[PDB]
Amino acid sequence: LNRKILINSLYGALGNIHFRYYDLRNATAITIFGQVGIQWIARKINEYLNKVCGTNDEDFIAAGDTDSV
Amino acid sequence: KRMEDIGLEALGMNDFKLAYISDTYGSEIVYDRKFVRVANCDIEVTGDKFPDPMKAEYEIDAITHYDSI
Amino acid sequence: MKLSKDTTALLKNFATINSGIMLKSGQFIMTRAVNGTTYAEANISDVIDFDVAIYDLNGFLGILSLVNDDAEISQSEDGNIKIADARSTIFWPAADPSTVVAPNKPIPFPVASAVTEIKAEDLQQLLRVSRGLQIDTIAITVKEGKIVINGFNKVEDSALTRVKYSLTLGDYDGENTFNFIINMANMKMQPGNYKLLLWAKGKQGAAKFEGEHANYVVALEADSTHDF
Amino acid sequence: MKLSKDTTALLKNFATINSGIMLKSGQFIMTRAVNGTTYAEANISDVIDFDVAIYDLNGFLGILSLVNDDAEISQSEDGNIKIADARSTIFWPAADPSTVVAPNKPIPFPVASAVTEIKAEDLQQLLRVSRGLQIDTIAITVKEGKIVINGFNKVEDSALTRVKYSLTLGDYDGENTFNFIINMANMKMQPGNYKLLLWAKGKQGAAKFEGEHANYVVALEADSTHDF
Amino acid sequence: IIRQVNISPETIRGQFKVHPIHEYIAGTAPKPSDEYSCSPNGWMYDKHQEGIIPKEIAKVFFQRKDWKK
Amino acid sequence: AFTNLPSFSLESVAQHETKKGKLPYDGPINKLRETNHQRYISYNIIDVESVQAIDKIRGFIDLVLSMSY
Amino acid sequence: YVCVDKVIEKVGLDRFKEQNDLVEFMNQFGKKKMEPMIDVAYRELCDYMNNREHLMHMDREAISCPPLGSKGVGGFWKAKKRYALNVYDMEDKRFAEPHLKIMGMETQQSSTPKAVQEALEESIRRILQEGEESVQEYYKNFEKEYRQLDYKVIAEVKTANDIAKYDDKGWPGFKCPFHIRGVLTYRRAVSGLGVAPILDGNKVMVLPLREGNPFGDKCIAWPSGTELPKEIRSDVLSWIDHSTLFQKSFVKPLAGMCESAGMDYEEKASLDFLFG
Amino acid sequence: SKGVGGFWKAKKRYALNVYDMEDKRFAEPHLKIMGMETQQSSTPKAVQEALEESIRRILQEGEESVQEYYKNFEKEYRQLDYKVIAEVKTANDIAKYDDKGWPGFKCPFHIRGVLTYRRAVSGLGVAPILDGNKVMVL
DNA sequence: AGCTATGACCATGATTACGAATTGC
DNA sequence: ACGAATTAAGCAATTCGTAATCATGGTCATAGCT
Ligand SMILES: [Ca+2]
Known part of the structure; x- marks a missing residue:
């Protein structure tokens, strides 16, 4: 839990203007790549489930947030 | 600061550029508009989304800089 | 005074138009709309010897119907109306004539551009449908040599291109074309047979419904377009 | 197609169930309530020649009552409703069939578990009395070897044991027992004599009022217990 | 206002009895004072002694009048 | 300028004043x-x-020069 | 603001063969009554306050008045900081033509389209210069000619976000504010055309459709700057309540202004012509 | 059974009858819920337990069980303790609204209750409602 | 003397924008 | 809109209450007909 709170504190720190190494480009790249990754996995799950089930254009994904889905 | 922390009023003028100017000139100043250089500028940026002044993602391609001198 | 049943039946329909009235001497009863949109006239068989302005005319009629027909109407001692019954006496306040909106002279109706007639049941059905389907404008026009009346709602259509009601009134042999617009607020005449006269010239138009007892005059909206 | 006056009365009684009732080609009409707690149907002599869905059926009937019985009702050039009389033409907006909550198919009511007959006078008295005593729940049950219908109150009595109304209905030699109840939002049948049928299974039941003109079906609430 | 009635910081001579606004607007309130001028806020302003802010305002007004002439 | 134009876009003001x-x-x-x-x-x-x-x-540049001097 | 309705009447309008003569008499009696009155008033004020000196001078800045021989009203007031004056001689600058000094109305405001702004300014000029009948005729002819104007300038424009909004196959979901519902209608109409779907945060033009439309909605919304597919655009153009927008943006301000000046912008067409 | 198994309500609002969690097979299924009223602290404790059990019945038992338990808890609600049924939201920005112990401009419900408690008896020297604390509202 | 159609009202219902409290990845 | 010296994990989301505004049901009042 100590290590986890440290790691989770890193992302919060990287968005603080008073951080020594703050760069808005870096934080926005992290978060936008998170968005793109979760939606990419969403699309891949949708396609694979459509193939395996045999039907098409069906949204099998209930809902996803960040890493969880 | 010392007069401030003892609650004693300190006179004079606080800002010092004005005091420097007053002592440096004193008399009224005669000027010619030609010698002072005024640069009138504008830029043009092309971007899909509305360009953001704060982050400036897009490139710069058109600059106009008019010099009076 | 002694007012018969027919006179009361006539002037209650007139009371529906204008609450007040200005009963003058003679055998001619007149009413005008407060906003001057409808103007009604009738001739009665009762003698009138003094003039009086009535404000709550409907209550006056309620009192009259409450009492016997041979009740006598007089100028009361307090500058008001006195109703003497066979056994009772009633007092009714007299309104100031300046506070009653009444015509100052009979209106000579000009030469009618169009002449036709409408039956009692036709007008009755028209009024009931008018209350039912929320129509507020009625257009009198021509269609294949026949004069027709249509219903339009100004609230939903200001251009009047949605036919909701339509009736055929009579034949029309001519080439002058017309389309008159009447608001439903002026269609306040009593049920009964009527003769309809239409007059139009430039931006001056009017209509007249004359029945067996009473006559009504209705203004025409400026949106009406005629070719006379 | 023309609608008889009896058809109009039946349509108005059916309008009570739902302000908007759809119509189909044929001679069988049918509807349900918005919450599905009451259903009705009828077999009328007149045959409808076109499908149409009406939203303000009460208003439509009120307008229809203003014309003669020989009025011809049919679809118009724009898919709306048009009523042609001898001299008049009524336009009515045909509603979207989707925006009317109407039953999809006629209900094949199963075999009745219980059968009796309610006289016209009984229902006529009960419906008017229920308003007087503020009775909003009325329960039919089996008592002393007979079938009787007693009314209670619910606003202050959640136990449903405070007895306010009682009515002896008939005899029943049935070993099956039950206490069915109906709210007054479901009692909308017109005065008349109806065969009353009762069905109940699993955890739900229903009651049926079949008549010489129309049939009604009413739901039975949660407290309507049956021991079959 | 600043010129005709001195509102310079140092010309405050003390407080003045404040009446309701209606008394001042209707003229019903008595004359405040003859020695020093007053304002509806109710602070005594010197009449005999000229302030500094109205002096500057008068100087700028005179310069404006001369330059407009 | 004390002029309340409907919109302060450069095109609008140039059209209003320079008439170009x-x-x-x-x-x-x-x-x-x-x-x-x-x-x-x-x-x-x-x-x-x-x-x-x-x-x-x-x-206006002449104005700001006269101000500052 | 002074000189309402008394001084001019007290003397008589008959003394003015020309509106300019009325303006000259205005100047004459203004100079007659201005300096001594204001002088003694502010003298009383400074003496009451007993200050060193008095430095407050009045000066007639703006003079408005209805044009002579016309039924126009000239000047009215709507509310605080909302007023229009038919000014003639502003700060000693005689004008050959009237100047409509307007503040607070929709004319200078850019919420309405430029055509609507021009129409509003013309209506204001009409109510202040000639009067009722001209306002009536102008209103009628503008109603006649409004239907032919481009829909790009006579329709609504609004932002669009949360395109889904619990779509549920056309179901409004979260009370589509008369423009997201139009977005849904446009999406349903263009089904099969392959056009670009509407995205979040896009500016969309909205056109209310006539009642009983095949679209199934009394409004439609397509991305602003684009046009509805001509195939469906012709249909949406046939079903337009130019009236709805007209009563929203144009009729309401005219009604408010006319009732603020004792006027009526819709002809009543009474029977009084036959009454006399 | 007749249980739904799992259901959703909105973004970050869902309830699931989890059987295994990270390769840990559970002897009996246990409820996993994120967002609804049984995790929101502001909802009352007794209400928390009641609606948590109702959610469990929804996810495992079925409609009839939900109706039966709703009727049972409707019966049970009247004779419960006052402290265990109340919203427990915090309070902030004290000087925005207070006057004579009465609500001010845009006074929230909990703050209105706080001011009413101020008017209640007072003068006993009990701890105040200074911001950062938690208060039950009734 | 009473039923009933309709205007007013008084509150009621409904929708919108904004502040606030609380989760949760 | 120039105060001027300075400082410390982030965002997305729901849900409720309050304040503003428009549409309307139940009921009362008016009244009109019988
Ligand atoms: Ca997780």
């Missing part, structure tokens, strides 16, 4: 570079000339 109309253009700004680059650069140069003209007629 901007050359009309087609499409959106972002595609304007790739459609007519000549037109794009000429528009930017005109813009700078228009601000120079409003300065010349109103005479």
Whole structure:
């Protein structure tokens, strides 16, 4: 839990203007790549489930947030 | 600061550029508009989304800089 | 005074138009709309010897119907109306004539551009449908040599291109074309047979419904377009 | 197609169930309530020649009552409703069939578990009395070897044991027992004599009022217990 | 206002009895004072002694009048 | 300036005062570079000339010089 | 603001063969009554306050008045900081033509389209210069000619976000504010055309459709700057309530202004012509 | 059974009858819920337990069980303790609204209750409602 | 003397924008 | 809109209450007909 709170504190720190190494480009790249990754996995799950089930254009994904889905 | 922390009023003028100017000139100043250089500028940026002044993602391609001198 | 049943039946329909009235001497009863949109006239068989302005005319009629027909109407001692019954006496306040909106002279109706007639049941059905389907404008026009009346709602259509009601009134042999617009607020005449006269010239138009007892005059909206 | 006056009365009684009732080609009409707690149907002599869905059926009937019985009702050039009389033409907006909550198919009511007959006078008295005593729940049950219908109150009595109304209905030699109840939002049948049928299974039941003109079906609430 | 009635910081001579606004607007309130001028806020302003802010305002007004002439 | 124009866009003020109309253009700004680059650069140069003209007629740089001196 | 309705009447309008003569008499009696009155008033004020000197001078800045021989009203007031004056001689600058000094109305405001702004300014000029009948005829002819104007300038424009909004196959979901419902209608109409779907945050033009439309909605919304597919655009153009927008943006301000000046912008067409 | 198994309500609002969690097979299924009223602290404790059990019945038992338990808890609600049924939201920005112990401009419900408690008896020297604390509202 | 159609009202219902409290990845 | 010296994990989301505004049901009042 100590290590986890440290790691989770890193992302919060990287968005603080008073951080020594703050760069808005870096934080926005992290978060936008998170968005793109979760939606990419969403699309891949949708396609694979459509193939395996045999039907098409069906949204099998209930809902996803960040890493969880 | 010392007069401030003892609650004693300190006179004079606080800002010092004005005091420097007053002592440096004193008399009224005669000027010619030609010698002072005024640069009138504008830029043009092309971007899909509305360009953001704060982050400036897009490139710069058109600059106009008019010099009076 | 002694007012018969027919006179009361006539002037209650007139009371529906204008609450007040200005009963003058003679055998001619007149009413005008407060906003001057409808103007009604009738001739009665009762003698009138003094003039009086009535404000709550409907209550006056309620009192009259409450009492016997041979009740006598007089100028009361307090500058008001006195109703003497066979056994009772009633007092009714007299309104100031300046506070009653009444015509100052009979209106000579000009030469009618169009002449036709409408039956009692036709007008009755028209009024009931008018209350039912929320129509507020009625257009009198021509269609294949026949004069027709249509219903339009100004609230939903200001251009009047949605036919909701339509009736055929009579034949029309001519080439002058017309389309008159009447608001439903002026269609306040009593049920009964009527003769309809239409007059139009430039931006001056009017209509007249004359029945067996009473006559009504209705203004025409400026949106009406005629070719006379 | 023309609608008889009896058809109009039946349509108005059916309008009570739902302000908007759809119509189909044929001679069988049918509807349900918005919450599905009451259903009705009828077999009328007149045959409808076109499908149409009406939203303000009460208003439509009120307008229809203003014309003669020989009025011809049919679809118009724009898919709306048009009523042609001898001299008049009524336009009515045909509603979207989707925006009317109407039953999809006629209900094949199963075999009745219980059968009796309610006289016209009984229902006529009960419906008017229920308003007087503020009775909003009325329960039919089996008592002393007979079938009787007693009314209670619910606003202050959640136990449903405070007895306010009682009515002896008939005899029943049935070993099956039950206490069915109906709210007054479901009692909308017109005065008349109806065969009353009762069905109940699993955890739900229903009651049926079949008549010489129309049939009604009413739901039975949660407290309507049956021991079959 | 600043010129005709001195509102310079140092010309405050003390407080003045404040009446309701209606008394001042209707003229019903008595004359405040003859020695020093007053304002509806109710602070005594010197009449005999000229302030500094109205002096500057008068100087700028005179310069404006001369330059407009 | 004490002038309350309906909109403070450069085109609006230049039209109101210099009475010189901007050359009309087609499409959106972002595609304007790739459609007519000549037109794009000429528009930017005109813009700078228009601000120079409003300065010349109103005479504001001289005003700020007179202020500061 | 002074000189309402008394001084001019007290003397008589008959003394003015020309509106300019009325303006000259205005100047004459203004100079007659201005300096001594204001002088003694502010003298009383400074003496009451007993200050060193008095430095407050009045000066007639703006003079408005209805044009002579016309039924126009000239000047009215709507509310605080909302007023229009038919000014003639502003700060000693005689004008050959009237100047409509307007503040607070929709004319200078850019919420309405430029055509609507021009129409509003013309209506204001009409109510202040000639009067009722001209306002009526102008209103009628503008109603006649409004239907032919481009829909790009006579329709609504609004932002669009949360395109889904619990779409549920056309179901409004979260009470589509008369423009997201139009977005849904446009999406349903263009089904099969392959056009670009509407995205979040896009500016969309909205056109209310006539009642009983095949679209199934009394409004439609397509991305602003684009046009509805001509195939469906012709249909949406046939079903337009130019009236709805007209009563929203144009009729309401005219009604408010006319009732603020004792006027009526819709002809009543009474029977009084036959009454006399 | 007749249980739904799992259901959703909105973004970050869902309830699931989890059987295994990270390769840990559970002897009996246990409820996993994120967002609804049984995790929101502001909802009352007794209400928390009641609606948590109702959610469990929804996810495992079925409609009839939900109706039966709703009727049972409707019966049970009247004779419960006052402290265990109340919203427990915090309070902030004290000087925005207070006057004579009465609500001010845009006074929230909990703050209105706080001011009413101020008017209640007072003068006993009990701890105040200074911001950062938690208060039950009734 | 009473039923009933309709205007007013008084509150009621409904929708919108904004502040606030609380989760949860 | 120039105060001027300075400082410390982030965002997306729901849900409720309050304040503003428009549409309307139940009921009362008016009244009109029988
Ligand atoms: Ca997780």
